[PDB]
Subunit: 136 residues, 4 copies
């Protein structure tokens, strides 16, 4: 199972059908990836939610401006969200090797020794780690 | 203002963002067109909902099966809905001039003496009336 | 392999990305299903095409009117195209059992003793057969 | 008329119907903005094409990877493009007032003394200019 891929699919799929929110099973590691998506503007925010004893994390999805002429659909904010490292085929990179995602117009989340950081943060703290996902 | 075309545009636009329901200011006539739209399968149903004294009609939109392959969007049931008889540009058809919409694979909804009728109902009752809208 | 499903997927997939045409490997049976899709308005037409010795059938896709406000995308004509009968799980129906597809607002193609016919034709010639697909 | 916004709208609309190319009436300036759009990856390229004496620019649109699961639509590369400085509503920014578009994950394209420059190029050359459009 890859929980993290399963969260990111649950998120991308809820935006594709313009939902206000989506609940993924709670975890500290998922909570910190949500903590970065929220600070960087890809989601509105999240909130812990216990539904009949089980912990969930309720993600509040964000949508951008109305489209340029009578088309009701908002412009999306998460255009591409995707796993890199994973179950069976892991990807690690060191401080010198952190890629600039989509020419600087995208962010990559890394799990590093100093915690879950964006590639721009990682580089600054001088850490490398596991490339969890890329998003723009 | 055109009443009826607000309601049709608001049903069209709710479905294009996969909304569970949309509310239209209530009216005997609006109830009629929804009574017909729901029965020919294009909406789930409606409830007259008064929200704050003012009557509303809570249209419960219908969507079909998910698509073939991981595409999260349901397939739609309302694929086309448009007002034909505008105000100041009224269209009336007398029975033999009731048109066949989309080769016979769409409905027209008439307003007639015999009530509010779908095109085959108007032909069967032999009535003529004003052409409200077409939907397929 | 199910050639017929593979044609219908090739067609549905080309409309989803607004292509002018698509070439499926030629066959008499595929040519007659195209002959009905064309007469009923779901495609513009088709044309036989030999490309380096191999026979193909080039389908010319049809699109409906511009959308109701600055959205460039035409309104589609084939909304739903799908196999019923198939490899491994076949479906036959007799003259009395031919379903009305989508309440009369859709067509079903049947392979019958009197050839490939629509359900409306089949019923008229008094034949039943194999439900190849439904489309609206 | 606004020239530039015709070109931007025609690139936007071509991609929304997955067109391989779109032609815009040629111009030194249009060449400049395309020179920049192609180099930051948002279009494949262009060819000045004269079609019938009148010069045209044949923009070759770029689209990314197909999506995850049988969804035939490629993912887009141009997700947002809009004219900021209109005619009769001109916007000029002097270097320190050059904005950061979409948190730093989008580009602005300036017209300046030092040529046609993307926002970081204008900050690096320390130039100011008029704000043509934003794209991410």
């Amino acid at each position: 199972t890859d929980p993290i891929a399963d969260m990111l699919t649950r998120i991308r799929n809820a935006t594709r059908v313009y939902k206000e929110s989506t609940d993924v099973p709670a975890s500290r590691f998922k909570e910190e990836i949500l903590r970065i998506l929220a600070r960087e503007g890809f989601i509105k925010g999240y909130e812990r939610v216990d539904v009949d004893g089980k912990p969930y994390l309720r993600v509040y999805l964000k949508y951008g401006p109305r489209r340029q002429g009578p088309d009701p659909r908002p412009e999306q904010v998460i255009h591409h969200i995707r796993r890199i490292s994973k179950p069976g085929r892991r990807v690690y990179v060191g401080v010198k090797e952190i890629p600039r995602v989509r020419r600087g117009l995208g962010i990559a989340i890394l799990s590093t020794s100093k915690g879950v950081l964006t590639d721009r943060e990682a580089r600054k703290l001088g850490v490398g780690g596991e490339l969890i996902c890329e998003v723009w």
